[PDB]
Amino acid sequence: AAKDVKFGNDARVKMLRGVNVLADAVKVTLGPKGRNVVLDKSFGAPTITKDGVSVAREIELEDKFENMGAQMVKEVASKANDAAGDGTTTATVLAQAIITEGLKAVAAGMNPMDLKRGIDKAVTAAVEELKALSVPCSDSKAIAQVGTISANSDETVGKLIAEAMDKVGKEGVITVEDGTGLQDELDVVEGMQFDRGYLSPYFINKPETGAVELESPFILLADKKISNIREMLPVLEAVAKAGKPLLIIAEDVEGEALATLVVNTMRGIVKVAAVKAPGFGDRRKAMLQDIATLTGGTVISEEIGMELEKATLEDLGQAKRVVINKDTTTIIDGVGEEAAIQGRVAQIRQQIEEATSDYDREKLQERVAKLAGGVAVIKVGAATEVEMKEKKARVEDALHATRAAVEEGVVAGGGVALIRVASKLADLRGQNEDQNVGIKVALRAMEAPLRQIVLNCGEEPSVVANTVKGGDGNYGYNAATEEYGNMIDMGILDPTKVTRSALQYAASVAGLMITTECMVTDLP
Amino acid sequence: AAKDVKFGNDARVKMLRGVNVLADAVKVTLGPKGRNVVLDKSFGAPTITKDGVSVAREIELEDKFENMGAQMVKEVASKANDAAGDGTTTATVLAQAIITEGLKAVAAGMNPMDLKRGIDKAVTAAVEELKALSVPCSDSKAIAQVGTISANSDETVGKLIAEAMDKVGKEGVITVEDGTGLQDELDVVEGMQFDRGYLSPYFINKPETGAVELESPFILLADKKISNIREMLPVLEAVAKAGKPLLIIAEDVEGEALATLVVNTMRGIVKVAAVKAPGFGDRRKAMLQDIATLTGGTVISEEIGMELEKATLEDLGQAKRVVINKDTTTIIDGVGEEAAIQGRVAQIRQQIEEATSDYDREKLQERVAKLAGGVAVIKVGAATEVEMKEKKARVEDALHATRAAVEEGVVAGGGVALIRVASKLADLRGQNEDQNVGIKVALRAMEAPLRQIVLNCGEEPSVVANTVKGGDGNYGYNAATEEYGNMIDMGILDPTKVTRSALQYAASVAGLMITTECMVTDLP
Amino acid sequence: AAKDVKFGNDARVKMLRGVNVLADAVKVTLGPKGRNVVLDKSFGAPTITKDGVSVAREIELEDKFENMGAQMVKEVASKANDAAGDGTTTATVLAQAIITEGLKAVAAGMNPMDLKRGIDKAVTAAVEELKALSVPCSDSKAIAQVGTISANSDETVGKLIAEAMDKVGKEGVITVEDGTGLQDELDVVEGMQFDRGYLSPYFINKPETGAVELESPFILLADKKISNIREMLPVLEAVAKAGKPLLIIAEDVEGEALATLVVNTMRGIVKVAAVKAPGFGDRRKAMLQDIATLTGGTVISEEIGMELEKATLEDLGQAKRVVINKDTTTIIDGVGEEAAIQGRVAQIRQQIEEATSDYDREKLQERVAKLAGGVAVIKVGAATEVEMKEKKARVEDALHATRAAVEEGVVAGGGVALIRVASKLADLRGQNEDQNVGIKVALRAMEAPLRQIVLNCGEEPSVVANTVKGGDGNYGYNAATEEYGNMIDMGILDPTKVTRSALQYAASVAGLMITTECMVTDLP
Amino acid sequence: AGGGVALIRVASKLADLRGQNEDQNVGIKVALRAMEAPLRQIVLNCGEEPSVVANTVKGGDGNYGYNAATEEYGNMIDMGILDPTKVTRSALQYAASVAGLMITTECMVTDLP
Numbered sequence A, B, C: 001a002a003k004d005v006k007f008g009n010d011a012r013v014k015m016l017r018g019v020n021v022l023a024d025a026v027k028v029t030l031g032p033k034g035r036n037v038v039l040d041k042s043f044g045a046p047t048i049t050k051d052g053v054s055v056a057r058e059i060e061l062e063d064k065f066e067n068m069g070a071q072m073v074k075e076v077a078s079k080a081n082d083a084a085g086d087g088t089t090t091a092t093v094l095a096q097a098i099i100t101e102g103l104k105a106v107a108a109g110m111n112p113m114d115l116k117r118g119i120d121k122a123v124t125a126a127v128e129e130l131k132a133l134s135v136p137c138s139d140s141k142a143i144a145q146v147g148t149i150s151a152n153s154d155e156t157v158g159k160l161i162a163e164a165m166d167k168v169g170k171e172g173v174i175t176v177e178d179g180t181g182l183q184d185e186l187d188v189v190e191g192m193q194f195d196r197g198y199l200s201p202y203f204i205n206k207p208e209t210g211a212v213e214l215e216s217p218f219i220l221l222a223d224k225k226i227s228n229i230r231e232m233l234p235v236l237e238a239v240a241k242a243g244k245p246l247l248i249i250a251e252d253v254e255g256e257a258l259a260t261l262v263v264n265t266m267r268g269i270v271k272v273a274a275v276k277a278p279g280f281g282d283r284r285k286a287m288l289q290d291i292a293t294l295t296g297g298t299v300i301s302e303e304i305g306m307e308l309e310k311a312t313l314e315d316l317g318q319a320k321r322v323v324i325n326k327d328t329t330t331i332i333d334g335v336g337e338e339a340a341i342q343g344r345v346a347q348i349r350q351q352i353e354e355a356t357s358d359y360d361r362e363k364l365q366e367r368v369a370k371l372a373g374g375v376a377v378i379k380v381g382a383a384t385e386v387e388m389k390e391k392k393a394r395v396e397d398a399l400h401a402t403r404a405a406v407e408e409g410v411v412a413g414g415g416v417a418l419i420r421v422a423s424k425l426a427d428l429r430g431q432n433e434d435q436n437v438g439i440k441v442a443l444r445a446m447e448a449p450l451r452q453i454v455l456n457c458g459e460e461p462s463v464v465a466n467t468v469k470g471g472d473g474n475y476g477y478n479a480a481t482e483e484y485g486n487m488i489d490m491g492i493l494d495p496t497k498v499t500r501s502a503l504q505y506a507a508s509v510a511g512l513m514i515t516t517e518c519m520v521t522d523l524p
Numbered sequence D: 001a002g003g004g005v006a007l008i009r010v011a012s013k014l015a016d017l018r019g020q021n022e023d024q025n026v027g028i029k030v031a032l033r034a035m036e037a038p039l040r041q042i043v044l045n046c047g048e049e050p051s052v053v054a055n056t057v058k059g060g061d062g063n064y065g066y067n068a069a070t071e072e073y074g075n076m077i078d079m080g081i082l083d084p085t086k087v088t089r090s091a092l093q094y095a096a097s098v099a100g101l102m103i104t105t106e107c108m109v110t111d112l113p
Helices: A009-027 A052-058 A064-084 A088-107 A112-133 A140-150 A155-168 A229-242 A256-267 A282-295 A338-354 A358-373 A385-408 A416-425 A433-456 A461-470 A496-515 B009-027 B052-058 B064-084 B088-107 B112-133 B140-150 B155-168 B229-242 B256-267 B282-295 B338-354 B358-373 B385-408 B416-427 B433-457 B461-470 B496-515 C009-027 C052-058 C064-084 C088-107 C112-133 C140-150 C155-168 C229-242 C255-267 C282-295 C338-354 C358-373 C385-408 C416-425 C433-457 C461-470 C496-515 D005-014 D022-045 D050-059 D085-104
Strands: A003-007 A037-039 A047-049 A173-178 A185-189 A191-194 A211-215 A218-221 A246-250 A272-276 A317-325 A329-334 A375-380 A410-412 A475-478 A483-486 A493-495 A518-522 B003-007 B036-039 B047-049 B173-178 B185-189 B192-194 B211-215 B218-222 B246-250 B272-276 B317-325 B329-334 B375-380 B410-412 B475-478 B483-486 B493-495 B518-522 C003-007 C037-039 C047-049 C173-178 C185-189 C191-194 C211-215 C218-221 C246-250 C272-276 C317-325 C329-334 C375-380 C410-412 C475-477 C484-486 C493-495 C516-522 D064-067 D072-075
Touching (some): A009 A064, A009 A088, A009 A496, A037 A052, A052 A088, A064 A088, A088 A112, A088 A496, A088 B088, A112 A410, A155 A185, A155 A375, A191 A282, A218 A282, A229 A246, A246 A317, A272 A317, A385 A493, A385 A496, A416 A433, A416 A461, A433 A461, A433 A475, A461 A475, A493 A496, B003 B009, B009 B064, B047 B052, B064 B518, B088 B496, B140 B155, B155 B173, B155 B185, B155 B375, B173 B329, B218 B229, B218 B282, B218 B317, B229 B246, B229 B256, B282 B317, B282 B338, B282 B358, B329 B375, B375 B385, B385 B496, B416 B475, B433 B461, B461 D050, C003 C009, C009 C064, C009 C088, C047 C052, C052 C064, C064 C496, C064 C516, C088 C433, C088 C496, C112 C410, C112 C496, C140 C385, C140 C493, C155 C375, C173 C191, C191 C358, C229 C246, C229 C255, C255 C272, C282 C338, C282 C358, C385 C496, C416 C461, C416 C496, C433 C496, C493 C496, D022 D085, D050 D064
Parallel strands (some): A173 A375, A246 A272, B036 C516, B218 B246, B246 B272, C218 C246
Antiparallel strands (some): A191 A329, A410 A493, A475 A483, B003 B518, B192 B329, B211 B317, C003 C516, C191 C329, C211 C317, C410 C493
């Protein structure tokens, strides 16, 4: 296909226009007083939402270069959301601010590379200042408080997250589940969670969460890469006859096998889920053996002798429920005798005892922690089904927020942390004047989000920003109550991880945009 | 007439385009290797010139806003030329550089007022550095050297100007004249020059020099303002029968009298020129009395009783030759009894001796110096008439350049003085960052002219600029010989006044252009 | 007066287009086998001519920039024609060749200044080679031969010019006339010639020769510069009532007097011709006195006392016939007492002996030679009027050619001298590569004219050019006979002055044209 | 020495080369400026002045040259800016071949739009 090429200033202008469109689409939703955006649906039922993630997902322009800018900002915002769990709108507005100011400075004739260097230096100092400013959230009381605050000021969700969080451990795995009764309960079952995801997005059965779940599925453990559908065809036929979902774990599934599995999933004839084997090499075999022990199945290993055709229903692993997401996959309550689990953990412990290198000891310790820690099950119960689903969604959102908080602390939310950081860094300097201008660009960039929030509230942006700058610490302006105070003590909290990831990703995408000089796209 | 208004960025863009057109028209002629520009003549014979003054005069664009920019730059360049006698192209290119960089910075978001303040501070420091770098030219030998250098390396012109100012003084008035014979003759005759100019440009009889001259004209001295044509008309017809040009000196001439005088000049029926009286009040009346004593005529005052109607040929002053320019007016060899002049200067001397205030003594000293010093007449002779005119033009240009040099010294020409100064001012700083940006703009602007000169030479601009910057003192690159060294020794000399005036006027016009926000013009 | 400005490449493209149009219009007439061009007369009588001067005069384009190029080429060609007497087409085609090759080289990236320097060096060497190749034409027999050859191989014209030059001298003034009888008559009458021309082309009475002549006109000698029409009005009306034309000689005529004289000339009510005084200062006074003595009139001297109003018919000078051209003015057979002229020349002679400086002695020698030599009058007769006029035109053209020849010798005609010079100079080198490119451009340029001649003849240009290059000396190709040989022996003679002037003017205009970077012209 | 300074060194060495004809000399000068170009492009990407850096490198000798990352001259081999001789030689030869084909091309045949 023939390509249309834009060089230098005009290409940057087109990308700036695309970023401006996307940011103006997703910035009105920012803030407690944020507006709402109407998104058309093909069915004919317009969707009204204050969620910036959906607006960003739907937005993509018709012009090619505007589409480039919008899609790049969408990519970095989605990466920030996946890494942290929030901050998509904050990352997008930060990216727009940096891109606008940096492109203006470039149009001034200044060096883009030194501008990017200054931006990176300012953002690194900003991350350092944020780490200095963050307050700990390790204690159970603070865990409950942040869970309550995240879950629309609900004490029950925060408390439940607190007891589950203590029960499973700080590094433990927590998974939400549907509660049959009115009350909620917490349970711990034998399970593990690895960092591998689904092979293709078409495996998703519930698009509202972007994840794959199976009820009582069969687990296949293969020690070899699977590329022939005929090899596992008898197993697929047997599991389809059994009428239960099938989960396959191998080194990789690709080619006609993956295509046939995806076609079967879209046709719905059989529920088959494909996830790659975690780790690599000896570690990969170790996790395969651990998963086989946990689920009670046996791994199909070429060197031992068994093949895919010889696999049976008994050979296949079985679990109560599994959850497959793009970032990670969780196995909950596999059918396994407790004696096997105890033997396996004792074997790993004695391996640690005979282990010598620190790296191998750490890997084995992580393996044994994953295998023996278990998974905490949260059953969300309520009076009616619809509010039960709403409460479950709130619980999982609060769980993500609490996980981020306990991972890296919590700062004063509402965008005041960025302004505090800018106030701290106002004295920063760079080697070249271009680096200084880039630093100033970054400072105004982190100034921007609270200005946008208070513009959504309808108050004066500059006056509120200056008043926040005048103060010190977590003191800041509250959007909901329209009056200043200690944002942390007023119930406005944002995990440090969310803000740090948003700032870093916005800085990276803005540097890429500023340093861009040529553009290649198909003809209209 | 309906007005069209442009606000902010677009008006600045239009002015930038106009200034760019004017500067690209008048910038090629800069430098010894400067190109030439062809100017249209309605007759049918195009004019090919390397003089930037003519190109700038001919330039005025079709678009109204482009015309605004071009006319403002032309105004400031013409003011610089009138003040100094050179530097029109240098002033224009400097103004274009400052305007371009300042508009780029303004589009970058810098405060225009702070930019103008930084430009002014940098230019003031540049003037100080130029005064530090200037070398004296008081001695007769250096005077002859600079006169020879200005006159295309001709020793005769330099030496002639040398004994001319030795005879009349450093501040004495010298006028070139057409030589009767082969050998050049220097003579001193009783005359004076004051600071008043012609009322309208239409009085110009030779547009090539932009000055008014009259041969054996009649001088009318009216102590009153002249506004009625019928008052001075009978004298006008009397001198019309006299067949000689008429020069009228009065406090002011305006209205239908000036209109009819301009009409007559356009028709050419009578060559009459009008010049305002010098000074104001009692000093003005004393100056008119001195002029009447010089020319032998009698001043017409309403207080004494006589009127312009009663004035006759006897009351009219008479001079051998007068020269009227926009900046100043010169009276040469006015016929008058010598003992009368001696008595008048003795009266002024005793007035000085009885004068009490220093202001009165200074004013009377200036009056007596002008009255008694006279004017030095240079009769430029040659073998043939055409080379006689060429040598006369060279002599008058060299006289202007040498006057500027003896006024404020001389620096190394060829534009290297500006780069030297910018090298000195590398550490200049302002109160605000925008002031620093303006300072950098000014430094690059002073860098520009030598880059333009060497670009006209066809060599590399940046390399030559770096080589000149690396050196110290008057060391620089020579355009003609394409080899570096001490510019003063090679005879590449520019008067300090010329460079200083060009820099100051370029700075002023650039500040006005940068601070411009609204623009008003007639509809097309 | 809004102006349209072109910069660099496009400006030079338009300029080359204009030069190409004019050159292709005037180049077909070149050569004995040259074609003819049809020109329009507004009356309705198309003119078919082989004269390139008329074609050049008629040509001026529509577009302003094409007009610029055409008018510059026309101006330099006319200057060459005035200086020499022919070669207008040769100068134009040479200029076109240089301009085309130089603009191509400039587009190649060569420095225009170095190209112009190389062109000037090559042309200087070409002039040296042309002087080396030129043969003398001092003896009377060669004068007769060149006069015959120039006048379409007519022996009578050549011999007539021969004894005319012998009678009056090589530097003597020769003027053609109309013979009363069949046989031609040569006579010597008292007259003088000076190098002053008419003020404006509107004084021309016969546009075919571009000259002004009057039959029995009155001569007015004014010692002062003239600007007021009322001054000479009584004398103008008196000479108008006398019925004879008036010729006025003064220092200068300008303003409304010149305007009214021009108006009267085109309206034709009274035919008055104006010519500036010869020389300047005391030399001008002496020449005016000599002219007044020759014409029998009296010079109107301001310092003696008489004015233009006091001037009378008897005080006016009277001559049998005068001829005024742009380059020079001729006075023929003024009525004056012979012994008065003898006394005047005796006074000038004794001034010569009493003179001490060489320059003054040479000036007085020139004055006495002009006073005593007189003018040689050639009266051309024939059987009928039309052939008499044709013979007179041929005689005057041959006289111009013979004057050029005796001034600077004669070289081989037909454009072969340029190729001979190029063959000699093929080894020339310059300081820089661009200078070498310019030298090669000049070589191809002087190659071009014979290529054009033989292309008009219809044969191959390159073959003939290389055949001529292979030979040496005056060996070359003849257009009429289509066979090679010694052009001097074959009767193809071009005066060295004509070729030298054509080459020099083409080189100068081509250098200016190449170095052109900007033009200023009115909007369409 | 990497960073494109080897080509400029070679051009400095070959500045005295001559050909049979004037057009051959013009082609040689074209080639010399061509191998001068890449370092100019690199230092233009760095944002510094191309011509000044190019002339400064030309005035040097040996492996002395400008470094893009550190923005300061020196011995490129000592500072770790290395390019294999095969890479530079092959790039120069292939550029020469394609430029020779392009320059001598006179006719082009393509399908209609």
